[PDB]
Amino acid sequence: YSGKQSYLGSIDIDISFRARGKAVSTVFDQDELAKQFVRCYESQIFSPTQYLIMEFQGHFFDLKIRNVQAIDLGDIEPTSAVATGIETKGILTKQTQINFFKGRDGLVN
Amino acid sequence: KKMRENNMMSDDVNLAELAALTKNFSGAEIEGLVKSASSFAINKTVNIGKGATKLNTKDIAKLKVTREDFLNALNDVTPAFGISEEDLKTCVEGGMMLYSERVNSILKN
Fold first, then answer.
1. Is A35 helix (H, G, I), strand (E, B) or coil?
2. Mutate which: A68, A82, A101, vs B, most B CBs within 10 A
3. What is the C-alpha separation between A69 and A41, in angstroms, rounded?
4. Pure H helices in chain A
5. Counting one residue from A and one from B, how many pairs have CB atoms under 8 Å apart?
6. Contacts of B46 in chain A (CB under 8 A)
7. Which of A53, A76, B26, B41 has CA atoms 20 to 30 A from the CA of B50?
8. How far is A7 from chain B (nearest CA, A)?
9. Contact status, residue B64 vs residue B44, Cβ threshold 8 Å
10. Rounded Cα–Cα distance for residues A38 and A49 (Å)
């Protein structure tokens, strides 16, 4: 389907608390979140607006992929425009740049 | 001051020249000039409006305000007391031509 853009270059994830009463002031390491994401889900296909439930140190979070950038192997620079359309899909890799943003609730620190 | 001591200012800018160019600037407009120059230098990376995600470590790891930024900034901030030298400058818009020598004599006088 994609032809060349088969990998995920940059992925943006909005993080929210599944339960409002479970808000924790704990400092979340984005690198650890990305490491857990790669460790638990490898070689999976994801699309924009797709939802996921993540269990990090016993804490349950709702993750929504707000946007995705698809790149082909051998592209030194990510000249491809970041697409918010659900058409674009990619394969997760151990080098994808994961950017975490506050969820619409804005409770995750 | 901090801009210079954090190796964030190019080696091209000459402050004496700038102090000479800003003729009637008061004390509160040099700050505006610095802010405008910084905004100009920043806008070359983020590209606000055309497309985001261009913010990456490489682009922001070598930020340096050059001299062209200040000259461009000189078109945004304008004095408030030096509003009558511009009119004098617009009265000789047609240009001076020395079609004879009497002109030179009167100028010398």
1. helix
2. A82
3. 18
4. 30-40
5. 6
6. none
7. A76
8. 17
9. no
10. 19
